[PDB]
Design a protein around this ligand. Structure first.
Ligand SMILES: COc1cccc([C@H]2O[C@H](CC(=O)N3CCC(CC(=O)O)CC3)c3cccn3-c3ccc(Cl)cc32)c1OC
Length: 335
């Protein structure tokens, strides 16, 4: 491997940790394609996330990021974030992007252009409606799902339907993103970040930060349950998406995050701790999930056991109780 590609995989291990191994297991040309897409997305997210970068500087950065892929000298030295090396050494990453077959470069570049437009749109608004939540998640995660799917089909390891069905790929991203947004309430609150949809939380409290106060914990948990029930709606599409995959290494890459989000939603459901700290699945639990998630019967079994767990925890008085039961019933009966 070239020095530059070695450096890319080092950044992948620094930035994705135990997830790097799953990416390194991808067959043939998919391996480098996904490694570089992952790093390019890390760089874009670092720019987006950086509250030290003014809106006037950030908008052109987000809008033009797709072009930087083609600018050998482009770098960004002013980031204060944790993964800033990918920005400071962007020339090494973009060199390797330019070394990919053009069919992969063109996927990545298009996705970055579209994601940048959307990210820029959300700099001067919080999320209002559930529809706006889906739009926000499309921009930061659904389009990742779409991009990856196109790499899978373009590499010919998966059927063209995988790349073309934007809605199923979109749902892969939305599921993950909403699970993270839900679980991360408190850390976001403390960071000055608000991603829970205003249309939903404003039905319980006056300000989103009110859920951190002990007197509102019943209302906070009801809102949590409502948002979780929303995220569960993506599961049918996740099942459909995963069921079409014929390459083992692609399957494992796609399935791993999905089963870990499933377990995380189960851990968070009706859980007051969401408002006191970071609820996480245990490392040994995550390792088993990762090892198990290698075929459809196995993944469906996992989904079913965690959905059943949530089903039996639904408080009768929960405002979303009938909605939660219905989505769980739908999931259990399709497969
Ligand atoms: C078809 O679409 C995907 C297939 C596989 C993975 C992803 C997605 O997974 C991570 C999930 C994730 O990062 N984690 C952390 C590590 C975990 C595994 C471990 O602990 O080792 C799984 C969940 C994620 C969440 C939100 C955005 N992404 C994302 C960014 C970039 C790429 Cl290339 C792919 C992803 C996909 O994007 C939706």
């Amino acid at each position: 491997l070239s020095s530059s590609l070695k450096t890319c995989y080092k950044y992948l291990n620094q930035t994705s940790r135990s997830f790097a191994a799953v990416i390194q297991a991808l067959d043939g040309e998919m391996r480098n394609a996904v490694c570089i897409f992952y790093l390019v997305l890390r760089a874009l997210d670092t720019l987006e996330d950086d509250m030290t970068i003014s809106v006037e500087k950030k908008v052109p950065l987000l809008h033009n990021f797709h072009s930087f892929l083609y600018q050998p000298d482009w770098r960004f030295m002013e980031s204060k974030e944790k993964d800033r090396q990918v920005l400071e050494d962007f020339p090494t990453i973009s060199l390797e992007f330019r070394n990919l077959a053009e069919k992969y470069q063109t996927v990545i570049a298009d996705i970055c252009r579209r994601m940048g437009i959307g990210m820029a749109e959300f700099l001067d608004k919080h999320v209002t409606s559930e529809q706006e939540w889906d739009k926000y998640c499309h921009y930061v995660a659904g389009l990742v799902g779409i991009g990856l799917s196109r790499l899978f089909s373009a590499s010919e390891f998966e059927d063209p339907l995988v790349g073309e069905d934007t809605e199923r790929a979109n749902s892969m991203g939305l599921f993950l993103q909403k699970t993270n947004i839900i679980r991360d309430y408190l850390e976001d609150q403390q960071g000055g970040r608000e991603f829970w949809p205003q249309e939903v939380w404003s039905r319980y409290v006056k300000k989103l930060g009110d859920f951190a106060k002990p007197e509102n914990i019943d209302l906070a948990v009801q809102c949590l349950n409502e948002l979780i029930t929303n995220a569960l709606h993506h599961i049918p599409d996740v099942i459909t998406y995963l069921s079409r995959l014929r390459n083992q290494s692609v399957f494992n890459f796609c399935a791993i995050p999905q089963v870990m989000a499933i377990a995380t939603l189960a851990a968070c459901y009706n859980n007051q701790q969401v408002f006191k700290g970071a609820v996480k699945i245990r490392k040994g639990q995550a390792v088993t999930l990762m090892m198990d998630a290698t075929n459809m019967p196995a993944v469906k079994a996992i989904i079913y056991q965690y959905m059943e767990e949530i089903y039996h925890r639904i408080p009768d008085s929960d405002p979303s109780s009938s909605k939660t039961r219905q989505i769980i019933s739908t999931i259990r009966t399709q497969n």
